[PDB]
């Protein structure tokens, strides 16, 4: 069946004196965004962001919009509480984030579930892998943890992660089976760039690949490098595929000694390129 994930990334940011916090939730299947909710609209609604979601009927959008609106109120409260727990100066913008969702392996049994939270960009509380206990990041989040233990909330999240989360991931993969599920293998090449009288930069490119995960490295004679290698962050092309490059500075006349290596799910055998 090969692995997949459903994930939501949710952010609220306070703007004191200038209105209610701005709240945005975005949903992904694997590396593909498919839904959003943004509180900055006259009439905010949960909305499709992938073609294959557009034929979900109105009851889907209604239910999801109700859940997102409840979350919006939860985030407003949490921003206020966290500020009190951490004894911060009033005024000032703060952020609360949540990331949650499910991964499946080669069956419809949940491989891993997530329910993690962050305040001001740093861990606050997260549900452990057992889906039974909580890791509190500090003594402020310990207050929250005791509240959530007494409520039995781990059971609530466990039920979602094992049930409805995986059910709907399954449905999304069917709706977008065409585009999700594909593997676009990287097209690779090396470019050559004079640097000085003594050396040159060789740059090894991987273009148009999906999914985003890839390994791209240079070697000097079968061994990984004893020198600096520039490796840029994997980056979106905009059209649903990804790009990456790795550059080495090498002495003139020794260009043939260096090999670029590309590993990706969509490649029968790893690629080896040489200038």
């Amino acid at each position: 069946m090969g692995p997949h994930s459903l994930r939501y990334f949710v952010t609220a940011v306070s703007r004191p004196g200038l209105g209610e916090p701005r709240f945005i939730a975005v949903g992904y299947v694997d590396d593909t965004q498919f839904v959003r909710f943004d509180s900055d609209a006259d009439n905010p609604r949960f909305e499709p962001r992938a073609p294959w979601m557009e034929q979900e009927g109105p009851e889907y959008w209604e239910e999801q919009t109700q859940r997102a609106k409840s979350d919006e109120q939860w985030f407003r409260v949490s921003l206020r509480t966290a500020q009190r727990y951490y004894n911060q100066s009033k005024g000032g913008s703060h952020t609360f984030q949540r990331m949650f969702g499910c991964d499946v392996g080669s069956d419809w049994r949940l491989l891993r579930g997530y329910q993690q939270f962050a305040y001001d960009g740093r861990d606050y509380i997260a549900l452990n892998e057992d889906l039974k206990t909580w890791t509190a990041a500090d003594t402020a989040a310990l207050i929250t943890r005791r509240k959530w233990e007494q409520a039995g909330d781990a059971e609530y999240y466990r039920a979602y992660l094992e049930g409805e989360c995986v059910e709907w991931l399954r449905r999304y993969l069917e709706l977008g089976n065409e585009t999700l599920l594909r593997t676009d293998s990287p097209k690779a090449h090396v470019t050559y760039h004079p640097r000085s009288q003594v050396d040159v930069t060789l740059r090894c490119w991987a273009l148009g690949f999906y999914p985003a995960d890839i390994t791209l490295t240079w070697q000097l004679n079968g061994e990984d490098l004893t020198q600096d290698m520039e490796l840029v962050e994997t980056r979106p092309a905009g059209d649903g595929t990804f790009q990456k490059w790795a550059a080495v500075v090498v002495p003139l006349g020794k260009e043939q000694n260096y090999t670029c290596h590309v590993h990706h799910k969509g490649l029968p055998e790893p690629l080896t390129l040489r200038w």
């Binding site: 949903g27 979350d71 509480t81 949540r98 409520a151 709907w168």
Partner: peptide
Amino acid sequence: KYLQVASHV
């Protein structure tokens, strides 16, 4: 499918 947070912080 989106799930709302159960309890307050």
